[PDB]
């Protein structure tokens, strides 16, 4: 549970001194691009149900063993729980790119959910591939411009793909 600003504050307190000037110029540029960060969240957030349905749509086209009887996501209840797990992961990705820090995504799902999927018998590979495909579709949905001002989304495509790869690797 950390912001960008609280991250700089905790680092400056562990140093024990005041915040240096270059960190303040970095935070000024962050305050200039924080709304820019926001547009992806605004346009990432609005298409979330389409994102998770298309992600499960491609995943269960890709691995039909999960839909097959005896598969882990075969049962209707389990399949609803599967879509719930995916939607939760997408929501915490949107939270982490809202606050601009991966510590919320770590705190909320990464530490426990690997052991949860081991204990449940859930294959970590399929949900890892699903989070990867969901992240690819999320950046693909975020990057296109419709009646949108020209802008550079490279460091925020960088950051969003970082958050998605952190989620997919912590899942394993």
């Amino acid at each position: 549970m950390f912001d960008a600003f609280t991250k700089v504050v905790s680092q400056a307190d562990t140093r024990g001194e005041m915040l240096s000037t270059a960190q303040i110029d970095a935070l000024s540029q962050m305050v200039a691009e924080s709304n820019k960060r926001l547009d992806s969240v605004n346009r990432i957030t609005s298409n979330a149900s389409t994102i998770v349905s298309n992600a499960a749509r491609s995943l269960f086209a890709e691995q039909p063993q999960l839909i097959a009887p005896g598969g882990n996501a075969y049962t209707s209840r389990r399949m609803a729980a599967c879509l719930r797990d995916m939607e939760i992961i997408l929501r915490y990705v949107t939270y982490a790119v809202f606050a601009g820090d991966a510590s919320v995504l770590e705190d909320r799902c990464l530490n426990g959910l690997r052991e949860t999927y081991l204990a449940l018998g859930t294959p970590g590979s399929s949900v890892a591939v699903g989070v990867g495909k969901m992240k690819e579709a999320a950046l693909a949905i975020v990057n296109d411009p419709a009646g949108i001002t020209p802008g550079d989304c490279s460091a925020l495509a960088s950051e969003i793909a970082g958050y998605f790869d952190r989620a997919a690797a912590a899942v394993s």
Partner: protein, 51 residues
Amino acid sequence: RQIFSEHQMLKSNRQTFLESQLKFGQITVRDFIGGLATSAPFLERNYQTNS
């Protein structure tokens, strides 16, 4: 049923994250009751409408 009443068991009030934590044994039934009684739908419907 105990914390919300039967009429408040709507799909929109359901705390899916608290239910998964309980089913995984991460939280006790007591902590689940605390999570329900501190939930947004409970505070909006039952706290804000009463003294």
